[PDB]
Amino acid sequence: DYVLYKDATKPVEDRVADLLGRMTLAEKIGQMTQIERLVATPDVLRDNFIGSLLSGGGSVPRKGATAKEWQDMVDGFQKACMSTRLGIPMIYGIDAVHGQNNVYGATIFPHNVGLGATRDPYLVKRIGEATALEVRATGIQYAFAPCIAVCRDPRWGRCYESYSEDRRIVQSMTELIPGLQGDVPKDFTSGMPFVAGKNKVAACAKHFVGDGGTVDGINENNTIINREGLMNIHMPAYKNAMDKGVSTVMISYSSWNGVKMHANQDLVTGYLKDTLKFKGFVISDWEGIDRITTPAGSDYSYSVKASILAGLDMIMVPNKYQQFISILTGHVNGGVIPMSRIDDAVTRILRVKFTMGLFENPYADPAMAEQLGKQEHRDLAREAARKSLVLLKNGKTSTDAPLLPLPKKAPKILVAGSHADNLGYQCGGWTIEWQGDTGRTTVGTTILEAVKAAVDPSTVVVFAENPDAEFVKSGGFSYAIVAVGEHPYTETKGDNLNLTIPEPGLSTVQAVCGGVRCATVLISGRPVVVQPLLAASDALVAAWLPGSEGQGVTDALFGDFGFTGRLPRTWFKSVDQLPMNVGDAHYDPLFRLGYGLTTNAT
Numbered sequence: 001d002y003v004l005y006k007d008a009t010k011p012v013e014d015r016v017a018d019l020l021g022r023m024t025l026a027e028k029i030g031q032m033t034q035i036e037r038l039v040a041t042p043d044v045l046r047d048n049f050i051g052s053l054l055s056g057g058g059s060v061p062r063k064g065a066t067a068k069e070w071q072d073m074v075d076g077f078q079k080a081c082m083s084t085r086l087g088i089p090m091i092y093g094i095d096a097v098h099g100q101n102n103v104y105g106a107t108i109f110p111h112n113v114g115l116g117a118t119r120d121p122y123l124v125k126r127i128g129e130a131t132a133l134e135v136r137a138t139g140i141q142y143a144f145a146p147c148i149a150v151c152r153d154p155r156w157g158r159c160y161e162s163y164s165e166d167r168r169i170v171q172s173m174t175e176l177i178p179g180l181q182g183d184v185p186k187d188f189t190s191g192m193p194f195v196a197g198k199n200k201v202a203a204c205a206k207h208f209v210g211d212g213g214t215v216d217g218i219n220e221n222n223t224i225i226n227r228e229g230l231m232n233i234h235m236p237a238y239k240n241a242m243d244k245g246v247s248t249v250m251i252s253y254s255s256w257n258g259v260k261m262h263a264n265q266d267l268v269t270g271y272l273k274d275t276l277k278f279k280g281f282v283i284s285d286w287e288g289i290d291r292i293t294t295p296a297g298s299d300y301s302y303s304v305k306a307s308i309l310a311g312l313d314m315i316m317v318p319n320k321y322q323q324f325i326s327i328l329t330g331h332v333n334g335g336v337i338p339m340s341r342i343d344d345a346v347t348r349i350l351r352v353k354f355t356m357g358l359f360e361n362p363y364a365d366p367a368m369a370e371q372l373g374k375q376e377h378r379d380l381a382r383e384a385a386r387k388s389l390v391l392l393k394n395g396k397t398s399t400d401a402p403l404l405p406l407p408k409k410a411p412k413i414l415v416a417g418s419h420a421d422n423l424g425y426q427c428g429g430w431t432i433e434w435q436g437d438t439g440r441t442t443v444g445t446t447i448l449e450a451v452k453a454a455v456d457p458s459t460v461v462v463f464a465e466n467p468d469a470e471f472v473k474s475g476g477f478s479y480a481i482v483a484v485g486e487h488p489y490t491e492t493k494g495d496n497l498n499l500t501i502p503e504p505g506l507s508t509v510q511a512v513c514g515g516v517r518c519a520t521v522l523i524s525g526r527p528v529v530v531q532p533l534l535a536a537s538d539a540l541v542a543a544w545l546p547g548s549e550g551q552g553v554t555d556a557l558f559g560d561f562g563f564t565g566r567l568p569r570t571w572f573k574s575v576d577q578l579p580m581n582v583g584d585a586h587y588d589p590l591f592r593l594g595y596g597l598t599t600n601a602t
């Protein structure tokens with residue numbers, strides 16, 4: 001017999017209905033199941049009709065694996081899935097949140113907070129375009145991005161993943177979506193999923209909803225706010241995402257007024273599906289359903305029931321798939337979860353797969369491997385890094401000569417600080433490892449290397465990680481560039497109540513600036529206590545977490561381009577003010593949202 005779902009000339013809805021009408025319960029629940037590569041095997045994927053795989057942070061085939069190695073791994077998993085009775089291709093997901101960041105040699109773009117500082121949605125679209133290509137270079141078809149959290153408290157470990165505390169800036173940056181997925185047609189219906197084809201990836205608006213609104217910025221915690229506030233701060237960018245055809249939405253670990261998002265039928269079904277008319281698929285976060293209960297995973301039967309009834313379509317298990325499949329099967333067999341709910345989840349998952357061309361191109365394209373770390377993408381990352389920089393100070397008094405831009409020609413210059421020659425530090429979390437890492441973890445250019453690449457051949461560059469005051473004063477230096485700040489962190493490990501940079505940092509700045517005129521480059525995922533750093537420095541730049549392309553920093557330091565970045569967040573005077581956002585009754589910032597000094601290119 002002719003098999004309609006296999007016919008590439010047929011409309012998506014027809015293909016979805018045709019395939020769905022053929023599937024067993026096992027095949028349906030399989031589609032709903034996403035498993036980590038570390039638990040996947042050809043037999044597992046085939047026997048359990050698995051619909052999706054992911055790499056968690058740092059979950060890689062080998063350290064230093066080539067683009068081809070990634071393609072081979074993904075294709076190996078795909079072969080097993082294509083060998084099932086129905087041959088439904090799996091979709092492979094990954095956190096490609098600032099480039100294809102788990103991958104060695106991938107271009108690492110500035111984190112979201114810095115991109116907010118650029119106020120350049122077209123730059124962000126271009127970054128999405130480049131990211132899609134580097135993700136496809138590794139055979140992966142699905143990026144868990146963008147995070148459209150509106151971070152309202154910088155004590156949150158994920159504040160750097162938020163473009164801004166101002167939802168209007170977050171809304172504007174949803175341009176990442178058509179970058180990743182491709183532009184939607186003129187005829188497009190808001191809420192439908194869209195991916196243009198094999199050179200693009202499925203995107204993911206996350207984390208629904210109010211992840212950036214938790215008390216004291218506590219990660220995964222309670223967002224306490226009335227519906228009006230939830231709707232005018234935390235929700236709006238989701239509607240922009242619907243208008244741009246975002247393929248998937250990931251649910252937040254957080255709660256809204258005490259109700260776990262992963263169990264919230266009102267918001268997931270009532271609002272996202274039934275009001276916004278979202279027609280792509282809804283995915284849990286990592287063990288998100290487990291964390292509905294306290295303790296997490298103490299009643300997995302309840303977790304499955306609550307999340308699936310709430311309207312989630314695909315569960316990022318990601319390890320204990322046997323338990324997940326067994327429990328869900330039992331719930332359906334016992335009539336506790338109706339077939340209509342299962343059929344809805346599967347319809348959505350298949351819709352996205354058919355729409356994106358996955359049935360036509362289930363395997364990696366070897367000719368895409370060369371897109372990984374490609375120079376054009378690094379040039380874009382370098383542009384982004386430079387545009388993200390916010391100049392906070394450029395002279396100690398109103399009568400001082402501006403320090404920046406610095407001359408490329410000088411007899412001798414000093415580069416200093418824990419962050420001057422540390423690629424891992426300048427990239428921050430979600431880089432190679434989940435939590436990021438220290439040192440030369442990938443291909444890139446540190447601030448020190450960027451300085452050496454920029455300066456006149458006659459200028460002697462001296463590096464000292466933590467020089468004492470005497471070394472600096474006796475060194476015969478024309479000026480110094482000193483880089484300090486936060487260490488890499490991700491999620492809960494980044495939650496921080498004091499927001500004071502680790503030492504040595506301030507001590508190094510004080511020692512260097514005490515001895516010679518200094519430009520301080522602050523590396524951070526967020527505003528941090530900055531008055532002491534300011535007090536010591538002739539100039540100070542908030543560089544955020546600029547990524548692999550440290551020449552973005554020197555492009556502005558040496559005046560190849562003027563500074564243009566403006567704060568996408570309020571800079572607080574002290575942490576005891578927090579939360580404190582532009583518009584509050586008490587608003588007493590050190591630097592207001594939108595603040596930024598400028599220079600002109602020399």
Ligand SMILES: *[C@@H]1O[C@H](CO)[C@@H](O[C@@H]2O[C@H](CO)[C@@H](O[C@@H]3O[C@H](CO[C@H]4O[C@H](CO)[C@@H](O)[C@H](O)[C@@H]4O[C@@H]4O[C@H](CO)[C@@H](O)[C@H](O)[C@H]4NC(C)=O)[C@@H](O)[C@H](O)[C@@H]3O[C@@H]3OC[C@@H](O)[C@H](O)[C@H]3O)[C@H](O)[C@H]2NC(C)=O)[C@H](O[C@@H]2O[C@@H](C)[C@@H](O)[C@@H](O)[C@@H]2O)[C@H]1NC(C)=O
Pocket residue numbers: 438487488489493494495496497498499500502503504
């Ligand atoms: C303000 O709040 C901050 C958040 O709570 C807090 O930072 C945290 O401090 C705690 C200790 O109190 C750290 O936990 C421990 O981390 C140890 C290893 O830490 C190094 O490596 C990790 C990455 O693996 C980095 O994140 C750390 O910054 C640290 O980096 C090292 O720092 C040195 C000094 O700057 C450098 O010279 C060195 O090069 C550098 N190394 C690297 C690789 O970058 C572990 O060994 C411990 O076991 C402990 O880990 C915790 O154990 C319990 C478990 O439940 C936790 O989940 C686990 O994390 C924590 O890493 C750190 N968080 C950061 C920085 O993100 C501030 O404390 C200050 O800074 C820290 C780093 C210490 O110097 C403190 O003495 C200092 O007080 C808070 N600040 C103030 C003023 O109170």
Ligand SMILES: *[C@@H]1O[C@H](CO)[C@@H](O[C@@H]2O[C@H](CO)[C@@H](O[C@@H]3O[C@H](CO)[C@@H](O)[C@H](O)[C@@H]3O[C@@H]3OC[C@@H](O)[C@H](O)[C@H]3O)[C@H](O)[C@H]2NC(C)=O)[C@H](O[C@@H]2O[C@@H](C)[C@@H](O)[C@@H](O)[C@@H]2O)[C@H]1NC(C)=O
Pocket residue numbers: 118119120562563564598599600601
């Ligand atoms: C010395 O530096 C100053 C400060 O940067 C330059 O003035 C700025 O020039 C920008 C244009 O390059 C102006 O931004 C634009 O503003 C208009 C209207 O608001 C907007 O339509 C543009 O899109 C653009 O806005 C940017 O868009 C991209 C975003 O990422 C970015 O955040 C936006 O700002 C900016 O307003 C202007 N600032 C001031 C205070 O005047 C100055 O550039 C020169 O003068 C300006 C006014 C403009 O005519 C430029 O063409 C011209 O080069 C620069 N001087 C020199 C010699 O270059």
Ligand SMILES: *[C@@H]1O[C@H](CO)[C@@H](O[C@@H]2O[C@H](CO)[C@@H](O[C@@H]3O[C@H](CO)[C@@H](O)[C@H](O)[C@@H]3O)[C@H](O)[C@H]2NC(C)=O)[C@H](O)[C@H]1NC(C)=O
Pocket residue numbers: 218220221222255258294
């Ligand atoms: C928001 O964050 C707070 C602070 O972490 C959460 O409260 C904490 O909840 C945990 C369990 O989820 C508690 O740990 C347990 O404490 C009991 C003793 O009461 C002990 O028997 C267990 O072994 C375990 O250690 C913790 O006490 C509690 N902390 C405080 C100070 O309240 C809260 O649950 C989070 N809210 C949301 C909605 O996520």
